[PDB]
Each structure stands twice: as structure tokens, then as C-alpha cells.
Design a protein around this ligand. Structure first.
Ligand code: NAD
Ligand code: NAD
Ligand code: NAD
Ligand code: NAD
Ligand code: NA
Lengths: 384, 318, 369, 320
């Protein structure tokens, strides 16, 4: 029975944000939960021993709900996928390493795998084609507004995410034709899975922007439509997700703005795209099962919160977890569930350490990344 | 109407007890606040479940996964058994634990139960409910063979007939009738198969079914779950004499998938999320109208509270 | 036990549905436990570790008197069941409560809503004031409206009665007797509610006949919780009275020369904490949170805890408040006993409170009658 | 009025202190409830600087549980520097501020067994702990002051020190006399020295009411009158002067919020609440519903940030 005293921001530490956030531990209530969230995240980035059943860099399962790509969290998630600090001396990747090119699972960045809900990566793409305004009919997802034009409109966004659908449809047709001419073995190889769809999307974002910028007529010169397209395509997390190789899983992709373009592209006569969900969970649940220490940081709740902890369920529990939603427990949902409800199933392990910060994401997640994540790559880079 | 009433509760002492509870539930539209929303929702749900039968209109139900872990699963089964529902939209757990509770029982517990002891005793907690691991061991005996059949059926057809969750869930209820002919009468999926009610689950692999698929694929690769034709399906069922009522108990993937693809004339919300989250589950009436989920002329009422208390009061027959 | 919900057969009667809430998970089980704990508050039994009937402390949120809960709380103050021959009750504002409830702790602005609903009608959505989807009209402080006249007669009656006792008395027998305490203020308001309405109905001009104004005044007065609370003798405590609509009249009634009224809070905390200290078996039903919840729990703290408790609110635990606190947080202070049974129903009051009153309280007074 | 795009990688070369500020400065353009925090920060910071003593006033309304947390030390800095003009809080907001000079509040956990906490003499405040010995010492400090106040009210015709304002002001004076060392860390003490009126109309709802109940069981006399505090709080919230920029900082919405904004005419208001509009209460801060009831003027600048004030208030009060 050791107990700390309750002390909040002093006279001498209201002049530096570093000491305010440091003293969040001894303030109370839910700022202490955020103080743990700072620490558990720092553990997730620390090279540790294998799972308590040879040091490893834990594999980080990050989970993001869709609407958060509309707000500034898209900027912070992009940082997690952009910066690549190399592994030190005597540390292996926690997961020992194993047309429609599938998703590579070798993540050279801070996070290692990214699960999102349907309509998430759509918000990312439409935030380089437009600019979100705060409080062609305008849509609302809370404090923020954006413009949602027609599916076959001349909006820059509508052009980008039809050339994307057309590129996917023609690539799926090529793979189907090649396996039609070959003898039957046996997997359905022409079916694209959400991980590949977002991976090949991030690969194509550059050329698709350069093409859509011309088809909409915003810029008439190719050499500076090619340059502006790459500059717009370097703002999306899809680009850095494909470049550094963090797979974007999404079992709820079927419920996104993409489907507005998938269906309308099928109303011309050609069949719809063929998705496969068994390939995503196989890659996801094997990325988790094969690992030796796993971190978990989910933003919000829903399909995304349950999918990453289910992936770690194949592993008899995850080692670290930080849950950042404003859901409540009385409804007994997999969004408002406590971290304890996870360890009863075995999604979170018994020899663990986790915390739930009962507050909205936009307040806490920008503080999380700027206090440890940017600071932890500044440590690994400046010192040397 | 449009005014708060005054009920002489003492007048209920002489009337029957059953009629007394109903007399108060009937005065709910003018009691106040989020009970008025319950009263307005009940009138929409009742008149929908009665009219929307076989006269040209439709009732579509959207429920979350935890609500069938509760007792509401049996209440929903009554709705599909009577062919009052036109279409069902659950996440993924609304199909699993509905079939599970034919292979075993869910138990009541408490939120205070120690989760570390529950793990060591093989007890999975769903809020204040418990699902023993033996239930999922039996589901592995039930579902893994069904995937073995579907894998052969897809391969012989080269992935053209049984690719979508709609057909899979429909044959899940058919397999439940064949394997377990006694307990199938209490399953929602069974009646959705027999009475021909389509069930939609675009995030199908998020749950125990995905884990069963993960085990099966790890030995025999080839199965495919293609959920994009279910969208063309669900839209074709919502494209409008033509009165389409949508009962959304709990929000999430049930709510968006239903109201985005179906154009409803009447919608009922029973949610708990707050607008500050800036998400879909925070059922904002005007904001959902701004995004095309609701038409501006659509009759809609939103109840804030746990659907476990609301749904029985809305579905209680007249 | 097994999780079973409303079946095929038992979807045709609301009794079986509300009975099967026990086997339905989540917050229906908490509401079913709230059903049982309320019946335990009504069952005559032995005192805490010579049978007694528990004294029930019910605390109500202010705005909840704007909604239909005013009707149910009025029932809790109206109907009364004689105690069986072999059971004893656990023993200016009197404490002799012959009714279902025995103490009423309400927030500031509650009884002002109780007064205002017999003067006009509260409207619903789809200058006028808002509190959710309900709308009421608070007219000017010195207006001709019926509510303003009733509240002015009340303040004027209280000021004149305070001066008389002041002039009357102008160590242990040296108390500030001219100070009026919130429990006495709302008590006297319930006594005067008949005559105050009859006088205000004339001063407004709606009914100039003395006979009809006398009959209509009693009809509007009988609808308020204040009337039956004063008639059957439940004290209406409110330390937050200083923050209500009534202060708009008390303050400007002092802007015409006469001093303001003189409140007293020590008399209220003494009467309240003594009704709990000398109690032998106590119940607690709190609608909402805030001042009302802590005041009832703190009253039972003087009795090293309460026996039964039912919290109907929609507050959360992460903010570390005394409104969103778990029932457990009560026993740590000693406000709730160890040998206790309590439950919190996480839901809006207007949904769960009518069910509770109709399902156990209405049924219990019919079983005993 | 537009969501920005911040290059987080650009923070790697700038200093760490400025980096954390580069994001907190960008909070108005992040989105959702960080924008409302950034807007609230701009209002609070400008009010805490400009409205020191130039015909302007800043009034703070906090709930009782937030001085159980560490925010009481932060609040003390505000009244210590004479930046606050008036304080509104429920009884506990006064109690535990004086308590934490007579003892320490500890950090615990929401999961702690409350039955064991009782058997171990620990009072739980969310995830905080207040030992019973703290209140045993508070009884030694407060029940003499009650006897002093009774003699003071009795021999003065019950009309010299009857309101909570004068009582709380003399609580800071008594805390200066009895405990001269620890009094510097209490909000009530600086409110006495800097002459900042503290208002608590629900005074007997808390440990102070228990101390009064124990004292009044033998010496029946001591009384309290909170209705003159309404005239007092209205006197301080009167901008007929037309050169008043009067800001109200409401951290946590309970009785403080209503009692302050109802009697004080604020030109700028900041809400830091958690309740939801579905409750239909005077805590679920509804901006337009408060305007309809006269709590917010139609020309008043107001922002509402949704979250635990334990996380919000430090970022709002963080001096730049
Ligand atoms: N582009 C679109 O049209 C769009 C947008 C959003 C969601 N959806 C669909 O709705 C389905 C479920 O919606 P969802 O996954 O986005 O969330 P959700 O509606 O299912 O709610 C998830 C829970 O996480 C919490 N939460 C959500 N957002 C939060 C936030 N910003 N801050 C703090 N807590 C938060 C809340 O407690 C919430 O109840 C998805 O499968 C998706 O397909 C579509
Ligand atoms: N809960 C399970 O047992 C279970 C089982 C298998 C799979 N899953 C998976 O977990 C994911 C999330 O499940 P979900 O569908 O429940 O979404 P969810 O749990 O994230 O829904 C959260 C939101 O829905 C509303 N809500 C939740 N519970 C409610 C209630 N009892 N009454 C009223 N409103 C309520 C609230 O607004 C809440 O903010 C799904 O993708 C699903 O596939 C869950
Ligand atoms: N007529 C008036 O002038 C008037 C009216 C209402 C309140 N007030 C003032 O506002 C102050 C605070 O109001 P309060 O005492 O009611 O507490 P509160 O409004 O600050 O909130 C109390 C808590 O109880 C819960 N709650 C409140 N109303 C609820 C409901 N209808 N259903 C379910 N849960 C509910 C909420 O979770 C809330 O957190 C009061 O002390 C009073 O002075 C004045
Ligand atoms: N548990 C305690 O902290 C404590 C201690 C001593 C006395 N009391 C007494 O309990 C009574 C009620 O307490 P209160 O009026 O001071 O507040 P409260 O406990 O009544 O809180 C009610 C409302 O204040 C808001 N709120 C509460 N905590 C918050 C937080 N951490 N962040 C943001 N918003 C928050 C919420 O909207 C909530 O609905 C008071 O009269 C007080 O005397 C409480
Ligand atoms: Na949206």
C-alpha cells in the first residue's frame, strides 16, 4: 500500500507545457489515466523481452474510427506512418518476418498495422481534394463540415475516387483473365481485399491526383500538375502507409463512401468489384499470432476496437493497450467495454498493463503523439 | 397533444394492474423529455409492425451485437417469426450469438465480476452477461463444417453463388434447422431463412465467425466473403403504398448501412452516444439529414437510453 | 440464471415484460433490481443490525418537476397505507409523514416548477424557456401573469409572517426565530396554496367571482406536490433554494424598501440529519444527481449508513463527481451501510421512474388495500 | 473556420517545449472538441491577462470535486495573483480546500473495493482517497470557528456575519491564524487576503453541515442566510458602467454554473462540462438553451468544450 499525494499544476510549472503534462499524473480523475496512457505508449516503443510465457521492438496495433480522419488526428496518424527510426543494436522486429500486389507487412515506422472503419480513408483522400470547414450540399460529422458532391460530379474528389475504382476494376480484370487462361489448381486471386485496396490506392495516389487535377481542369500544365499531384498525395496517410509498409485493414470497408463509386461504376454494365475478407483476417490474425510482444492503441470504438483485440486474441492476449474513447459501460457494448472486459475473453493478457482515457480523441491524441512519439524519435536521432 | 399532461396516479389503484401499466405507457408521449420520444417511437413502431405486413410496405430492423447477447434476441425472433420484419441489418455478433444460444446458454452476472478470475474460469464477459467457452467450442463443431460445405459450393461455382453474407447467413439458418431441429425455433436467423428475410452484415469477419474462418483458411485456403453485392441488394430493397419504416435499436454499422442504402419514410433511434463524439452512433437527427441518411420529410424520433429498457416498451403488443 | 427475454407469449402483457427484465441483461436487470429494492423499502421488517417500516428519503432533481415525474412524486405524497398493528415507524416543518415517502429533498427551482404547472401548461417541441424538448413561459418578475402573482403573494405572505415573529421576540433559549428555513418555507407554501391561488386568480382577472375563484383555486392547489406534501406532512428540504426562480421575487420584493427575507440552513440540516440519526431502517431513492444526492447520502451518514438505495440518473463515473458516483463510492464514506442492497440504473429518469412507481408502488398499495 | 494541416515531422528540429505548444496553438484548427478547447483557451488567456484590474472582472465557477483533484493548486495560483474577481462553488469546494492544509489527498483507483476502503478508513472521491483523519482534524479547526461565529452573530442581533461570503472570508482569516504555514496553498486563504468573495448558497451540503449539525445539537443558535449573497453576486455582475469586460470561467457545470450565470451578466463564458443534452438539466450546458433562459445574453461570446476539466483546465490556464 504505497500512495502518492494529489498535487496539480504549481505556480512554477504553468509556464511550460512539459511540466503541466508531467504533473498530470498527480492531478486526479482522468488526467491520471492520460498520464498512464503516456507511459504505456512509451513502453510500446521500448525494446523489451519476449512475452512472459532476445529483445524485440513491439508491434503496434493502432485503431482509428472513420470520422477522425476529418479532424487533425489525420496529421498525427500520418506522423506515425511517416517517421522511420531504425532498430538499435540487438533488437529484432517483434513479428519475425515471414497484377494485384498484396500488402507488405514490414513496417519501418513507429506503428506497424492500422485498422480503420468504413469511410475512413475516404475522408483522407477528400481532405487533399478539398478543405474541411468548421461550424453540392454540405455534410456534417459534428463540429466539422465538408462538401459532398455527386458521385459522377466534376469535383476533384469525385474524379480521384473514380479513377481509383476504374484502376482497381481494370487490374482485377487483368488478374481474372490470367487465371482464366491457366489451369485450375486454388484461391480466388482476382478478389481484392481491403488491405490491398488501400495499399494499391496509396501506391496510385500520386498518379491519380495528377490525372484528376487535369480532368477537372484546375491546372492545365502537366509538369506542374504532376508536381502538385505528388504534393497533394504526400499529405494522405495512404501514401506513407504504402511507402513504409503498414497494412490498412478494414472489415467495414463495404460501408464507406467508396461504395457510392463502386456501385455507380457497375451501373454501366461491367460487374462490381469482388472483395474478400478472409484474406485480411488471415494476414491480421497471423501478424498478431506470430508476434512476441504487441502494443494496442485504438482511437474511439466500434468495429475497429473489437477487430484489433480479436487479432490479439489469437495470441492469448496483448501486452499493452491504450483505449481512447468517450463510451460508457452501462450499455454493455464492445465500444464502452472496460479494459477488464478484454482480459476476460483473452484479447488482453493477464500479465498486462493498460488504461482507458474516458475522454474525446481530439483533446488527447495530439497530446499523446507530441509528448512521447515525436520526443522518442528526437531521442533516438539527436543522441548520436 | 403538444402539451405536458397530468396523470392521476391514484386513479390506477382501481383499474387493473396490467391496464394500469399500459395507461401510463400510453401517456408517455406527454410525460416529458426522453419519455415523450419513447411514446412517439412506440406509436411509429406499433403502427409499422401492424401495417407493414403484406400490404406493400416494409419494416427493416437494425440492431447491435450486444442486444442479442441480452434477452432481446427472443423478442426479435418473435418479429421475424411473424414475418413483420422485411430486412435485418446486424454487425456480425448478431448472427453468431443468435446461433450460439441454440448450442448453449448465456448467463447473467454483474459488471463488478473480476475479469481475471472469469478468464481463469473460462467465462467471457459481455457487460453484465457471461458466455462460457463451451458455447464457442460447440459453435466450432457447428460452423466449421458449414464453411467446409460453402468452400466446396463456391469452388464448384467459381465464386458466383455463395459469396455474400446474405446467402451465407441464410444457409446458416438452414444448417441450424438441419443440424439442430429442436432449438432452431428460438433463433432469429432460422426464421429469417424460413420466412425469407435477408440478413446483412458487411463486417462479417469481425467476431467469432471470423476466427472460425481463420482456423479453416489456415488449412484449406479458397473461401471468399464478398460483401459488396449486399449493398446493391439492400439498396434494391429500399428503393420505393410505399412506406418504409426503419427500427434502429443501437447505432454503429447497423444504423449507417441501413439508412445510407435505404430511403425510409419513418425512422426510430434508440441510442446512447453523445453528439460530442462526432460519430455516426451519436444519432443526431438534423446532422443525419444533412448527410443523406434521412430525408428532410422523413418522420423520425430519437430515444436516448439503453435499448434493453426501450425496445420491450416499443415492441409490446397492443 | 439464464438470459431470456420477452417471449412469444409474454409480449402481450406489460407485467410479464417488466417481470422478465430480470433475465434480460444490461440495464434492464439493474431496473429489475431497482424494482426489488423499492419493494424491500416498503416491506415492514426489523431495524438495522420490534419490526419497523423503513423511512424513505427521496431526492429529486429540480427540472424533473417540469416533466411528468411531478405526477408520480405527487402520488408518493398523496396515498398512505396505515402501518400494521405490530410495526412501528422509525422514530414549522413537521416530520409526521403518513404516506409512501417520508422525506423529500429537492433542488433549487423544483417547487417553482411545481407551482408554475398549475398556473399554465408546459409545451413540447417537435420569453419561452427551454429544458430539453419541453418549453415553459417564465413571464416578468412584476408581470400580470398567474405564476408571477402566486409567487408574489407567497413572498409577501412570508415577509409579513416573518415580521410578526420578529416583532414578537423583539443562551440555549436564544434562537433567531424570525429566520425562515427552506423546509418551513415550502411547508407554509403548501398550506397557503389554496388561498394564494384564489387570491391570484382574482388579481389576474381570469375569474372575478369569489365563489368560482375559491373552487378553482383549490383545484389548482391540489395538483401541486406542495399541497399533499404539507397535508400528509413530508418535509421538503432544499439547501439550494437560494438558487431558484423564487429568488427573483424575494430579491426585488426587497427593492421596494422592505429588507430581504432571512433564510436559515442550520435548522434544515438539524431536522434532516436528526430524522436520519434517530431512524432505525432507511431507504434512499435519488432521481438524478447533484445537491439532492449528496444531501440525502450525507444525512444518512449520521446513521453510519443507509440500508437501501436506488439511484436513477444518467451520470458517468469518470468525472469523479458525487453525481456520477457508483453506489460503491457511498459505502466508503459510510453514507451507505455494509449490510446493504443498492443499485444504480444508468438511464434517463423519465423512462425508468414511471415504471418503478406503477410497477411496485401502485401495486404495493393495492396489495395492502 | 477551416481545419488545418500540421507537419508533425517539422516539430523534430524545433524545441520540445515549443513543439508541444505548436500543437496546442493549433488546437483551434484541429477539429471537434479540440477547436472548442482552443477557442476557450483564447478567451481564458485574454481574460486572465487583460481583466486583472482595469474595470474588468473574471469570475471562476468550479465544482466541488475539482478541488479534490490537483486543480485546487492551479486555482490557488489564480486567486493568489488577484486574477479572479469572484468564486462560486458548492460547499465541498470550500471544505476540501481547507482540508488539504490539514492533510493530504491521495491518488487511488476507481476499482478499489469501497467496502475495504471503509474498513480501512478511506473515503473515495472517484479515483482519489481522503482519509477520515483529515476530517477529524477539520473538526478541530472548524468547530471552534463556529463557536466564534455564534458569539459574533448572537451579540450582534443575528445580522453581522450570517452569509456564506463572510463565513468563508473568515475561514481564510482563521486559516491564517491557526495554520500560518500551509495556508499559502489554499484558495480560500488568498480569497481572504486578495478580497475575493466566495459564494456557496448550498453551504450545509457537505462536511461543513456535519460540523454545524454536531455543534447545533447542544448550542442551538448559529445560523446562515444565503439570500444576501444573491444581492451581493448581482452587485458584482452589473455592467451599467459599459466599460466592463466581465468573463465567466465555469469549470464543471453544477450549482456553480447556474448560480453564477443567472446573477452575473457575462460578456464571455467558457463551459467545461460532461453532461449530455438528453438529461434535460441545468448541467448539460446547452448554449442556445441557456440563452433562452437568460443565462447567456444574445450578444455574449460563449464556447463549450466537452471533457474532464482535469484535462481541459490545465491547457486553458497554461500561461503563454
Ligand atoms: N464516411 C461515412 O459515411 C462514415 C463515417 C463514419 C462511420 N461510418 C460507418 O459507421 C460504422 C460505425 O461507425 P464508426 O466506426 O465511425 O463509430 P461508431 O458510430 O460505431 O461509435 C464508436 C464508438 O467509439 C466512440 N467514438 C466514436 N468516435 C469518437 C471520437 N471522435 N472521440 C471519442 N470517442 C469516439 C463512441 O463511444 C462510439 O460509440 C462504420 O462501420 C462505418 O462504416 C461511415
Ligand atoms: N458485442 C459482442 O458481443 C460482439 C460479438 C461479435 C462481434 N462483435 C463485433 O464488435 C464490433 C462492435 O459491435 P457493435 O455492433 O455493438 O458496435 P458498438 O459496440 O461500437 O456500438 C457503440 C455505440 O452503439 C450505441 N449502443 C451501444 N450499445 C447500446 C445499447 N445497449 N443501447 C442503445 N445504444 C447502444 C451507442 O451509441 C454506442 O456509442 C462489431 O463490428 C462486431 O462485429 C461484437
Ligand atoms: N427553476 C430554476 O431556476 C432552476 C432549475 C433547475 C436547476 N437550477 C439550478 O441548477 C443547479 C444544478 O441543477 P441540479 O441540482 O438539478 O443538478 P444538475 O442540473 O447540475 O445535474 C445533476 C446530475 O443529475 C443527472 N440528471 C440531472 N437531470 C436528470 C434527468 N432529468 N434525468 C436523468 N439524470 C439527470 C445528471 O447526470 C446531472 O449530472 C441547481 O442547484 C439549481 O440551483 C435552477
Ligand atoms: N464527491 C465530491 O466531490 C464532493 C465533496 C464534498 C461535497 N460535495 C457535495 O456534493 C454536492 C454536489 O457536488 P457539485 O455540485 O460540486 O458537483 P456534482 O458532483 O453535482 O457534478 C454534477 C455535474 O457537474 C459536472 N461535473 C462534475 N464533475 C465534473 C468534471 N470532473 N469535469 C467536468 N464536469 C463535471 C457534470 O456536468 C455533472 O453533471 C455539492 O453540494 C457538494 O457540497 C461533493
Ligand atoms: Na460523415
Amino acid at each position: 500500500d504505497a500512495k502518492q499525494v494529489v498535487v496539480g499544476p504549481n505556480q512554477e510549472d504553468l509556464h511550460s507545457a512539459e511540466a503541466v503534462l508531467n504533473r498530470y499524473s498527480t492531478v486526479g480523475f482522468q488526467a491520471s489515466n492520460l498520464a498512464r496512457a503516456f507511459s504505456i505508449c512509451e513502453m510500446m516503443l521500448t525494446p523489451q523481452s519476449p512475452s512472459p510465457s532476445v529483445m524485440v521492438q513491439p508491434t503496434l496495433f493502432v485503431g482509428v474510427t472513420a470520422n477522425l480522419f476529418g479532424t487533425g488526428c489525420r496529421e498525427a496518424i500520418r506522423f506515425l506512418c511517416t517517421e522511420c527510426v531504425p532498430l538499435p543494436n540487438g533488437v529484432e522486429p517483434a513479428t519475425p518476418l515471414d497484377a494485384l500486389k498484396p500488402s507488405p507487412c514490414d513496417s519501418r515506422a513507429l506503428i506497424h498495422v492500422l485498422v480503420v472503419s468504413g469511410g475512413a480513408m475516404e475522408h483522407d483522400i477528400r481532405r487533399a481534394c478539398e478543405s474541411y470547414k468548421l461550424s453540392g450540399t454540405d455534410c456534417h460529422f459534428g463540429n466539422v463540415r465538408y462538401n459532398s458532391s455527386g458521385v459522377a460530379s466534376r469535383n476533384l474528389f469525385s474524379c480521384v475516387m473514380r479513377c481509383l475504382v476504374k484502376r482497381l476494376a481494370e487490374a482485377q480484370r487483368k488478374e481474372k483473365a490470367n487465371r482464366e487462361a491457366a489451369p485450375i489448381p486454388d484461391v480466388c486471386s482476382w478478389a481484392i481485399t481491403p488491405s490491398t485496396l488501400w495499399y494499391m490506392a496509396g501506391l496510385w495516389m500520386a498518379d491519380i491526383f495528377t490525372e484528376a487535377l487535369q480532368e477537372t481542369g484546375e491546372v492545365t500544365d502537366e509538369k506542374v500538375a504532376s508536381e502538385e499531384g505528388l504534393k497533394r498525395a504526400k499529405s494522405t496517410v495512404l501514401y506513407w502507409a504504402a511507402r513504409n509498409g503498414v497494412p490498412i485493414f478494414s472489415p467495414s470497408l463495404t460501408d464507406g463512401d467508396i461504395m457510392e463509386f463502386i456501385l455507380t461504376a457497375g451501373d454501366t454494365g461491367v460487374p462490381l468489384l469482388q472483395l474478400d475478407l478472409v484474406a485480411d483476417i488471415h494476414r491480421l490474425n497471423r501478424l498478431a499470432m506470430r508476434s512476441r510482444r504487441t502494443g494496442m492503441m485504438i482511437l474511439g470504438g466500434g468495429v475497429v476496437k473489437h477487430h484489433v483485440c480479436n487479432a490479439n486474441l489469437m495470441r492469448n492476449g496483448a501486452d499493452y493497450a491504450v483505449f481512447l474513447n468517450n463510451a460508457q459501460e452501462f450499455d454493455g457494448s464492445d465500444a464502452g467495454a472496460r479494459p477488464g472486459e478484454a482480459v476476460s475473453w483473452g484479447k488482453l493478457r493477464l500479465d498486462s498493463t493498460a488504461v482507458k482515457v474516458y475522454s474525446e480523441v481530439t483533446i488527447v491524441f495530439p497530446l499523446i503523439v507530441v509528448h512521447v512519439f515525436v520526443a522518442w524519435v528526437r531521442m533516438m536521432r539527436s543522441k548520436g | 397533444s403538444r402539451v405536458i399532461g397530468d396523470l392521476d396516479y391514484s386513479n390506477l389503484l382501481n383499474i387493473g394492474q396490467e391496464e394500469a401499466i399500459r395507461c401510463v405507457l400510453n401517456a408517455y408521449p406527454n410525460i416529458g423529455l426522453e419519455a415523450t420520444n419513447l411514446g412517439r417511437a412506440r406509436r411509429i413502431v406499433q403502427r409499422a409492425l401492424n401495417d407493414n405486413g403484406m400490404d406493400g410496405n416494409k419494416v427493416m430492423l437494425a440492431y447491435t451485437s450486444n442486444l442479442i447477447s441480452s434477452g432481446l434476441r427472443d423478442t426479435f425472433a418473435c418479429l421475424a417469426r411473424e414475418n413483420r420484419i422485411g430486412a435485418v441489418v446486424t454487425t456480425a455478433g448478431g448472427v453468431e450469438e443468435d446461433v450460439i444460444k441454440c448450442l448453449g446458454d448465456t448467463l447473467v452476472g454483474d459488471f463488478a465480476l473480476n475479469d481475471h478470475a472469469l478468464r481463469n474460469n473460462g467465462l467471457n464477459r459481455v457487460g453484465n452477461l457471461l458466455v462460457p467457452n463451451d458455447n464457442y467450442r460447440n459453435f466450432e463443431d457447428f460452423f466449421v463444417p458449414l464453411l467446409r460445405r460453402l468452400h466446396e459450393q463456391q469452388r464448384d461455382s467459381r465464386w458466383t453463388t455463395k459469396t455474400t453474407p446474405s446467402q451465407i447467413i441464410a444457409e446458416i439458418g438452414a444448417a441450424l434447422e438441419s443440424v439442430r431441429p429442436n432449438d432452431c425455433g428460438s433463433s432469429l436467423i432460422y426464421w429469417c431463412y424460413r420466412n425469407d428475410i435477408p440478413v446483412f452484415s458487411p463486417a462479417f469477419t469481425d467476431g467469432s465467425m471470423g476466427d472460425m474462418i481463420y482456423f479453416y483458411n489456415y488449412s484449406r485456403k479458397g473461401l471468399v466473403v464478398d460483401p459488396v453485392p449486399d449493398v446493391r441488394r439492400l439498396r434494391q430493397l429500399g428503393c420505393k403504398v410505399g412506406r418504409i419504416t426503419c427500427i434502429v435499436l443501437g447505432a454503429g454499422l447497423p444504423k449507417h448501412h441501413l439508412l445510407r442504402n435505404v430511403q425510409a419514410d419513418a425512422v426510430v433511434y434508440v441510442t446512447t452516444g453523445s453528439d460530442a463524439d462526432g460519430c455516426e452512433s451519436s444519432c443526431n437527427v438534423m446532422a443525419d439529414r444533412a448527410n443523406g441518411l434521412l430525408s428532410p420529410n422523413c418522420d423520425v424520433v430519437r430515444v436516448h437510453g439503453d435499448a434493453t429498457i426501450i425496445s420491450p416498451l416499443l415492441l409490446l403488443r397492443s
